[PDB]
Design a binder for these strands. Structure first.
Ligand SMILES: C[C@H](CCC(=O)NCCC[N+](C)(C)C[C@H](O)CS(=O)(=O)O)[C@H]1CC[C@H]2[C@@H]3[C@H](O)C[C@@H]4C[C@H](O)CC[C@]4(C)[C@H]3C[C@H](O)[C@]12C
Ligand SMILES: [Mg+2]
Ligand SMILES: [Mg+2]
Ligand SMILES: [Mg+2]
Lengths: 52, 94, 177, 1114, 315
DNA sequence: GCATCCGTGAGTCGAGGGAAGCACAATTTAACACTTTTGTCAAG
DNA sequence: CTTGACAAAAGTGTTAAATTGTGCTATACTGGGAGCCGTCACGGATGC
């Protein structure tokens, strides 16, 4: 059940694009936005704000 | 159950690695006509036929028994595939 | 074991002038009890030639040497006027139940194999009573009751069973080790 | 073997003809015997009087009468030549030229009407078929509550199926009553005005309820003339068409006033008059007369709706599942409906032909084209859902199939779109539809069976009989009555005690509107005829039904249909009393027409001399193959010179013993576990059953081959097949067909056929082979018919139909057809399915020798061993009581008739068991035998279990055990007794049609699909096993990646992969690595056909060609 | 379960003595039964444990073979150096497990000797064997258990008769009490102290309470008077059946629901052994059809959910 | 807040299921004497 | 290993015959017809 719920909670929604090309309200995967955020922090850019 | 199945499962970190090793050893045994076996003549698997006892034709049984004996080395990046096949052909012509 | 009826190719057919079909006639024949008076006799063929109108029974078979029909009153078929029954019944000697699909005996082209139940013994029971002898009261009284079709008497069947058990007990004599 | 009858309920009336629902309905539909001038306006006569006269409007085609001729061929000839048993239908028609006033009359051949056989079935294309009756919502006027909004009601006017649109009347929140037709809502005010209704009329009639009439007083259109109101309504119903008076009046008249397009039906009209308290002149919502529309039902419907909304005491909502609101379309009504559709198409053709051509020089024969009528009729009798392949495994199977009622079919519900409500057992099913008999699964509740005493009336409503009760005495007056009429009376139960005819019990269990109540004898108005009327024919054949759970009684009744006839079939020891009636009404057995003497008895015919002196010869159906392959033969049961009375049995039909239904064998059953061979419903049987040919059936298989015309030459059915030895052709006769009586095994030739080979040069290796052996390639190849794997038997019949034979309508290009009937005698074997009437079923898992089976102390072995653990979970205790009564009868040499819910009770069974023990132990005592030592041990154990009373003698304890149905049973393997007494009795067990012989199938390689190249499916096609999605999921969960890849590629559709794998295996090598499946290539090509660029890439995103360069343009 | 369940007697059941010789002598006189719980001097024992003291399982099973004692008789056995007081059936089960696993000590540590072997105990034994030994020995133990269970269920004498569905004497009294309470409720309703809905609820509660009491009475009768009853043994061991089905066979069928969902005021007071009436059978048909339709329409929903779950977590 | 539109609804198995002419121009096919090549048989 | 014919199976032109494709017919004719509720129920998404 936890595996299935983990699949259920796999996605997030953008609230503030920050210094990225994403759109506010866009739905993507949590891993993708986390990787994008860490990359943006790597070169000193505004992180993407997301919502579970 | 297969004989010594618990020991076979305990000899590897993942059961699918055990299956891969057994299948690859069985294919090696089939390709060279069981002449590359590490089993002594008293250890070769046998089947009862109307004529009499003969060598077991099932290579998976031979591979499992060989893996039980512990004279086989299994792992990743041991030897190059081409070199391994060439040396196995040279030592065991077929 | 086998039956051949003239002008009949298989058992799934009906004979003109005969009330019963060949399946029913074969079923009736399966209840025929034949006793061989010669121990060396292994196979007999009984010929039956009947013309209607009559009730052809087991007593209408032609007499054969060293062969007896233990149930002459067994009903075989009912022949209507204008009907004829010419048939040959091959009776073999054997042991156990051999289906017609196993032996497959056909004396001729149109012979019909018949499932053969060679066992003459119809029923066996045995009864144990609390007999007493002397001062001990735990003894057993054994009573074997044997019902047989009549071809083999119950005493003969008991003797054969005892001999078979003795022969099988002799198999424990020579150890192969 | 005497029969002892139990029960106290005296049935006043016998069971009605069980097939009357088919026979009477079709007789009414056809009316072939009543003279034309006395024919009533029903059935195809009604269809003729409805579609005719045909007027172009001065050509008028009037219908005067019709007649049905004798069938061209008899039923046997139709079956043998694959024909349809039908009668020619001619119509007498006159063409009137209104201009000249001249009439020309001639008889036109309208076609062929399929005929119903005496048993109630049809022969369509040589195959027996049954038209299953369809239950549906009766037409009429209904008033249902609105679910979205409480306190509101909606009125539905429903015509006959495909005979007009449903009419919805709903009081909207605004207050305007809205009429919904054809998904379109409009104000009912407009149509009500179109029907010549003014404001004062509405205020006077519907104005006595409240504001509801005020919602129907819109004066914006009341003053508007009826003509413009009609045009406005026409604009509402179909917007866009140019508003014209003629078109609009035609459309409205067709929608609500045309008898030829709107038909409320006789049942619908009757229900409308009964509910609304009015009298319809016709069967239409309105009448069109004097150039104006007159209302028939809209005002009464709206008045009832308004009064119901107001809350008058006398008006109530309608339960749409109430069986008084649900009606039955039998074979007659369905055939009449399809005949009317075909007649309407024919009328269209006749109208279009009289428009053209010389109106002066026209005859009724030229105008009438009967092809559409024949097309509609053949479509109904062949490709209809309700026209089902007849189920004739045994006579009970056909009897059930003729009494089945299906909610599905054209005009009914859908298997998946049907909810729980339509599938539930309504309270009105009591006595009309069997509650327990229904196919479990997707069709539960959708298909049911007519009750035993139930009959469908003229209008299609199922009626059940009740005995009139007046003043406390139950009279012999029986009233057949419907559910809506049944709801008005207090109906007692058939088991109510009676002192003669007076009701003796002070408290009577009764039903009031389906609810159980306790009433006084003076409050009872009707009584049930018998407990049998509640259940169908199949369920009435289950003794001790009151001790079986309904879920298992369902299974037992369903499996009674699947039992195969046996060569030694015998009627059950415990019967219910319907076996004789089932055999008699199935028309499988033969009975004497009147008193007489039998003149000739033969396996093929019975010739009887009746009292009047006429010789009557009845041929006997011998070894006939049913639709399911079972052998249906009649065996004579009389002798020459025997005196027979009227109705006396002459010959048993299939599955009948002396006129009693015999679906199986009566076997000695011990209820006890046995070495795990009884595990999970498995059954253990003795070899003695096979020795004396019990559960042995005869099955006939039909193999068909055709010799055809081909461009290369004609296929020849000949014995000279190229490249075959004499051993293969040994059993073939000179004509190339297998000789009758030959024993054929799988791979043996039935009919030898050679076909011309396609012109194609051989492969060079074949050419070199032929040159080496010096053998010239022949022009023909073996295409002969051989026995499929797992089949065979004895060739019992050969039928050869040739082109030009009388009545043989072969398809074009087919020179001849040969059919081989091969009969095999199947004995009971491991994997065969046995069952009993109480829902206990299982496959034979072990066949023991006689010396291994448990045996009685007298030496009698048991025949079947059943696992007791199947009893507690299933709660079918009727099998236990049947076993006890069977033990009693077995030792008493008698059979029993115990009717369901009124029959043998436990005290009676125990007294019978006391008599049985008396004989069974008196035999032992007279023979000079006491009590066994091992019997004493079992008695000691039993008194430790409290089964027998301590302190009694061993004989008395054995008697107690026998009265409990248990005996001291011995183990044939050890000779020691079973430690506890075992329930041993005689039980009736049926051998079902499901046999492992017809179900075992295996395949290595075989045919493949055309597109996907995957293996076909089905044992008949030698197909593979479907490895669906869930199996793939199981392999993925196991982690068997390579097994999954093999099943997906190497064994299904990798053409190169499968070829290489087979070649490697036959060479003793390991199968190669698989490749891309052909299904993926098909997927890619289809996606490309959808203009989608699907490209397979590599690690470096470069395209990878999976088509081997065969689709790349250079 | 049949071999590992012990016998209980009632003949003696309580007499006290001074010396074991007096208890024995009372046993040969027929005053006390073999398995009846008695007190010798201060301790509570049985005649079986004193009369039959076996030096090893071999002697106990030899005595069983000679008919001296049964597998269910509680006797004293010297096993693994301990003077156990168990039945030869339980000692036999211990030997079965020991020979299946080829280790006496581990098998002794794996089993619960002092209880009959129901489904749960056997499942725990299989799990512990899997933990301690592996797949091979667990499969061997499973095969041994299968063999011995089949053999003993065959030779034991389990059968289903009409009298095996014992009707408790308490059912008639409970039905009379329910009828009297129903008459009292009807009188109260005629007096107007309660409305239709609460009267219907009280009727339902009364009939549910009566059904529960009848179930308890059925199972109490089984566990007191017929501990080896086939229905009771099958239910207790977990082989087949549940208390509801045993009640329907032995007690009363109970309340049934209308097709709309409402329960009929009158229950089905007759069981399957007594036989339902036509009206009661028709009433039960509603629930049977409802259950069948529910099962028919539940498979599609379950399969569709399973496919959704597969396709969301397949990766 | 509701209205409308759309896609979804277990698996395996079997069993039978299976307005029309009429004239005329092109075009294709069949057939038919003739030249071939293609096998053979004869000796050198 | 070669010519030196030669029966024959194959290939090659025209032709008469079926076979197939196309045009044309002159009283006047000028907007279809099968539809038809146990409308399947219920979430998800769009969009007014
Ligand atoms: C302990 C005894 C030998 C010990 C010794 O050698 N000394 C072994 C050797 C052979 C074993 C039987 C057979 O396997 C058949 C069968 C297998 C089932 O699984 C369990 C029951 C059976 C009867 C076994 C019981 C027991 O386990 C035996 C007698
Ligand atoms: Mg015999
Ligand atoms: Mg079904
Ligand atoms: Mg002692």
């Amino acid at each position: 059940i936890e595996i299935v719920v983990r699949q259920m909670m796999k996605y997030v929604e953008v609230t503030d694009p920050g210094d990225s090309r994403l759109l506010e309200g866009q739905v993507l995967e949590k891993w993708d936005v986390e990787a994008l955020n860490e990359r943006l922090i790597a070169e000193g850019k505004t992180p993407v704000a997301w919502k579970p | 159950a297969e004989p010594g199945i618990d020991k076979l499962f305990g000899m590897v970190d993942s059961k699918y690695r055990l299956t891969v090793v057994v299948a690859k050893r069985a294919q090696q045994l089939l390709r060279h006509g069981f002449k590359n076996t590490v089993l002594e003549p008293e250890e070769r698997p046998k089947m009862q036929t109307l004529e009499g006892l003969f060598d077991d034709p099932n290579a998976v049984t031979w591979a499992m028994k060989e893996l039980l004996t512990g004279r086989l080395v299994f792992g990743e990046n041991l030897v190059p595939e081409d070199r391994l096949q060439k040396e196995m052909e040279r030592l065991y012509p077929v | 074991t086998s039956v051949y009826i003239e002008d009949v190719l298989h058992e799934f057919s009906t004979i003109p002038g005969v009330k019963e079909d060949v399946v029913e006639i074969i079923l009736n024949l399966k209840e025929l009890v034949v006793r061989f008076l010669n121990p060396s006799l292994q196979t007999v063929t009984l010929l039956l030639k009947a013309e209607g109108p009559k009730e052809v029974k087991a007593r209408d078979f032609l007499p054969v040497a060293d062969v007896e029909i233990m149930n002459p009153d067994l009903h075989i078929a009912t022949l209507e006027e204008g009907g004829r029954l010419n048939m040959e019944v091959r009776v073999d000697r054997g042991v156990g139940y051999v289906p017609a699909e196993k032996h497959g005996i056909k004396d001729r082209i149109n012979a019909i194999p018949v499932d053969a139940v060679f066992s003459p013994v119809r029923r066996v029971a045995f009864q144990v009573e609390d007999t007493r002898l002397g001062q001990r009261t735990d003894l057993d009284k054994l009573t074997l009751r044997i019902w047989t079709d009549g071809s083999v008497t119950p005493l003969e069947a008991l003797n054969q069973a005892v001999e078979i058990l003795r022969e099988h007990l002799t198999y424990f004599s020579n150890p192969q080790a | 073997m005497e029969i002892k009858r139990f029960g106290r309920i005296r049935e006043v009336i016998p069971l009605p003809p069980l097939t009357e629902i088919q026979v009477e309905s079709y007789r009414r539909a056809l009316q072939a015997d009543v003279p034309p001038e006395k024919r009533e306006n029903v059935g195809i006569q009604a269809a003729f009087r409805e579609t005719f006269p045909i007027e172009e409007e001065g050509l008028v085609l009037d219908f005067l009468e019709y007649r049905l001729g004798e069938p061209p061929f008899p039923q046997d000839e139709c079956r043998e030549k694959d024909l349809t048993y039908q009668a020619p239908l001619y119509a007498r028609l006159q063409l009137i030229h209104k201009d000249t006033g001249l009439i020309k009359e001639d008889e036109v051949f309208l076609g062929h009407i399929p005929l119903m056989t005496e048993d109630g079935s049809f022969i369509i294309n040589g195959a027996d078929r049954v038209i299953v009756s369809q239950i549906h919502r009766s037409p009429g006027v209904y008033f249902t509550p609105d679910p979205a909004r409480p306190g509101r009601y909606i009125a539905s006017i429903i015509p006959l199926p495909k005979r007009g649109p449903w009419i919805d009347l709903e009081v909207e929140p605004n207050g305007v009553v809205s009429m919904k037709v054809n998904k379109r809502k409009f104000p009912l005010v407009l149509l009500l005005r179109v029907l010549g209704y003014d404001q004062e009329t509405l205020a006077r009639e519907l104005g006595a309820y409240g504001e509801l009439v005020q919602g129907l007083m819109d004066e914006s259109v009341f003053a508007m003339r009826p003509e413009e109101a009609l045009i406005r309504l026409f604009t509402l119903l179909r917007p866009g068409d140019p508003p014209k008076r003629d078109k609009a009046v035609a459309y409205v008249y067709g929608l609500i006033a045309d008898p030829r397009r709107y038909d409320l039906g006789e049942a619908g009209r009757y229900k409308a008059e009964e509910k609304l308290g009015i009298r319809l002149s016709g069967r239409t919502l309105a009448r069109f007369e004097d150039g104006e529309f007159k209302d028939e039902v809209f005002l009464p419907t709206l008045r009832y709706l308004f009064a119901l909304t107001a809350g008058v005491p006398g008006h109530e909502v309608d339960d749409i599942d109430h069986l008084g609101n649900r009606r039955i379309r039998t074979v007659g009504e369905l055939m009449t409906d399809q005949f009317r559709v075909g007649l309407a198409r024919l009328a269209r053709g006749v109208r279009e032909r009289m428009l053209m051509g010389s109106e002066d020089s026209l005859t009724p024969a030229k105008l009438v084209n009967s092809r559409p009528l024949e097309a509609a009729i053949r479509e109904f009798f062949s490709r209809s859902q309700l026209s089902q392949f007849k189920d004739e495994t045994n006579p009970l199977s056909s009897l059930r199939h003729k009494r089945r009622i299906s909610a599905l079919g054209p005009g009914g519900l859908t298997r998946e779109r049907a909810g729980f409500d339509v599938r539930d057992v309504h309270r009105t099913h009591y006595g009309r539809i069997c509650p327990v008999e229904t196919p479990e699964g997707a069709n539960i509740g959708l298909i049911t069976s007519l009750a035993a005493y139930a009959r469908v009336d003229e209008l299609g409503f199922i009626r059940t009989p009740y005995r009139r009760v007046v003043g406390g005495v139950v009279t012999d007056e029986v009233v057949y009555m419907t559910a809506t009429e049944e709801d008005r009376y207090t109906i007692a139960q058939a088991n109510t005690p009676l002192e003669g005819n007076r009701i003796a019990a002070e408290r009577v269990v009764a039903r009031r509107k389906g609810e159980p109540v306790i009433v006084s004898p003076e409050e009872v108005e009707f009584m049930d005829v018998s407990p049998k009327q509640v259940f169908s024919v199949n369920t009435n054949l289950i003794p001790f039904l009151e001790h079986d759970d309904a879920n298992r009684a369902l299974m037992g009744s369903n499996m009674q249909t699947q039992a195969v006839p046996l060569i030694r079939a015998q009627a059950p020891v415990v019967m219910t009393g319907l076996e004789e009636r089932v055999v008699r009404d199935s028309l499988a057995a033969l009975y004497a027409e009147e008193d007489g003497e039998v003149a000739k008895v033969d396996g093929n015919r019975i010739v009887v001399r009746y009292e009047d002196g006429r010789l009557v010869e009845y041929p006997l159906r011998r070894f006939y193959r049913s639709n399911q392959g079972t052998a249906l033969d009649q065996r004579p049961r009389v002798v020459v010179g025997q005196r027979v009375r009227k109705g006396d049995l002459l010959a048993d039909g299939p599955a009948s013993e002396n006129g009693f239904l015999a679906l199986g064998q009566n076997v000695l059953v011990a209820i006890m576990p046995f070495d795990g061979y009884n595990f999970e419903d498995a059954i253990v049987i003795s070899e003695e059953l096979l020795k004396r040919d019990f559960y042995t059936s005869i099955h006939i298989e039909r193999y068909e081959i055709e010799a055809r015309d081909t461009k290369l030459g004609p296929e020849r059915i000949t014995r000279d097949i190229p490249h075959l030895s004499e051993a293969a052709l040994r059993d073939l006769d000179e004509e190339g067909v297998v000789r009758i009586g030959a024993e054929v095994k799988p791979g043996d030739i039935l009919v030898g056929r050679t076909s011309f080979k396609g012109e194609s040069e051989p492969t060079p290796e074949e050419r070199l082979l032929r040159s080496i052996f010096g053998e010239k390639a022949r022009d023909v190849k073996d295409t002969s018919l051989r026995v499929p794997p797992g089949e065979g038997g004895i060739v019992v019949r050969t039928v050869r139909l040739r082109r030009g034979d009388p009545g043989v309508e072969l398809k074009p290009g087919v020179r001849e057809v040969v059919r081989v009937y091969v009969a095999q005698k199947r004995k009971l074997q491991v994997g065969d399915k046995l069952a009993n009437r109480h829902g206990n079923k299982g496959v034979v898992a072990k066949i023991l020798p006689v010396e291994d089976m448990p045996h009685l102390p007298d030496g009698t072995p048991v025949d079947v061993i059943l696992n007791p653990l199947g009893v507690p979970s299933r709660m079918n205790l009727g099998q236990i009581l049947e076993t006890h009564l069977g033990l009693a009868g077995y030792f008493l040499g008698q059979r029993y008739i115990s009717p369901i819910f009124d029959g043998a009770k436990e005290p009676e069974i125990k007294e019978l068991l006391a008599q049985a023990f008396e004989v069974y132990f008196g035999k032992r005592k007279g023979e000079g035998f006491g009590v066994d030592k091992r019997e004493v041990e079992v008695l000691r154990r039993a008194e430790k279990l409290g089964l027998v009373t301590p302190g009694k003698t061993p004989e008395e304890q054995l008697k107690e055990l026998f009265l409990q149905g248990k005996v001291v049973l011995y183990d044939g393997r050890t000779g020691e007794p079973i430690e506890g007494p075992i329930v041993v009795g005689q039980m009736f067990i049926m051998k079902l049609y499901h046999m492992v012989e017809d179900k075992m199938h295996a395949r290595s390689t075989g045919p493949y699909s055309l597109i996907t190249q995957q293996p076909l499916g089905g044992k008949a096609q030698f197909g593979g096993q479907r490895f669906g999605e869930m199996e793939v999921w199981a392999l993925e969960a196991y982690g068997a990646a390579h097994t999954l890849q093999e099943m997906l590629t190497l064994k299904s559709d990798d053409i190169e992969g499968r070829n290489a794998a087979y070649e490697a295996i036959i060479k003793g090598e390991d199968v190669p690595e698989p490749s891309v499946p052909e299904s993926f290539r098909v997927l890619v090509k289809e996606l490309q056909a959808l203009a989608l660029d699907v490209q397979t890439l590599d690690e470096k995103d470069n395209p990878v060609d999976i088509f081997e360069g065969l689709a790349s343009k250079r | 379960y049949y071999i590992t369940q012990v016998r209980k007697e009632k003949k003696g059941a309580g007499l006290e003595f001074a010396t074991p010789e007096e208890a024995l002598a009372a046993h040969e006189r027929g005053e006390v039964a073999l398995n009846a719980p008695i007190k010798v001097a201060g301790r509570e024992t049985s005649v079986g444990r004193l009369k039959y003291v076996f030096a090893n399982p071999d002697e106990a099973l030899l005595a069983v073979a000679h008919g001296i004692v049964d597998l269910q008789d509680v006797v004293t056995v010297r096993y693994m150096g301990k003077r156990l007081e168990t039945s030869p059936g339980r000692i036999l089960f211990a030997r079965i497990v020991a020979e299946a696993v080829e280790d006496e000590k581990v098998a002794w540590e794996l089993i619960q000797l002092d209880v009959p072997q129901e489904k749960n105990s056997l499942k725990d034994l299989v799990y512990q064997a899997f933990l301690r030994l592996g797949m091979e020995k667990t499969a061997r133990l499973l095969d041994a258990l299968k063999y011995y269970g089949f053999t003993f269920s065959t030779t034991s004498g389990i059968t289903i008769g009409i009298d095996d569905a014992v009707i408790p004497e308490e059912k008639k009294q409970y039905l009379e009490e329910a009828d009297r309470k129903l008459l009292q409720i009807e009188q109260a309703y005629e007096m107007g102290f309660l409305t239709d809905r609460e009267r219907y609820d009280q009727i339902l509660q009364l009939w549910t309470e009566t059904t529960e009491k009848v179930t308890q009475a059925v199972f109490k009768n089984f566990e007191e008077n017929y501990p080896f009853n086939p229905l009771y043994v099958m239910a207790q061991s977990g082989a087949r059946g549940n208390p509801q089905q045993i009640r329907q066979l032995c007690g009363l069928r109970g309340l049934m629901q209308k097709p709309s969902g409402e329960t009929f005021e009158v229950p089905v007071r007759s069981s399957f052994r007594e036989g339902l009436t036509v009206l009661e059978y028709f009433i039960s048909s509603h629930g049977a059809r409802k259950g069948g339709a529910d099962t028919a329409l539940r498979t599609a929903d379950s399969g569709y959910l399973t496919r959704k779950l597969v396709d969301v977590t397949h990766e």
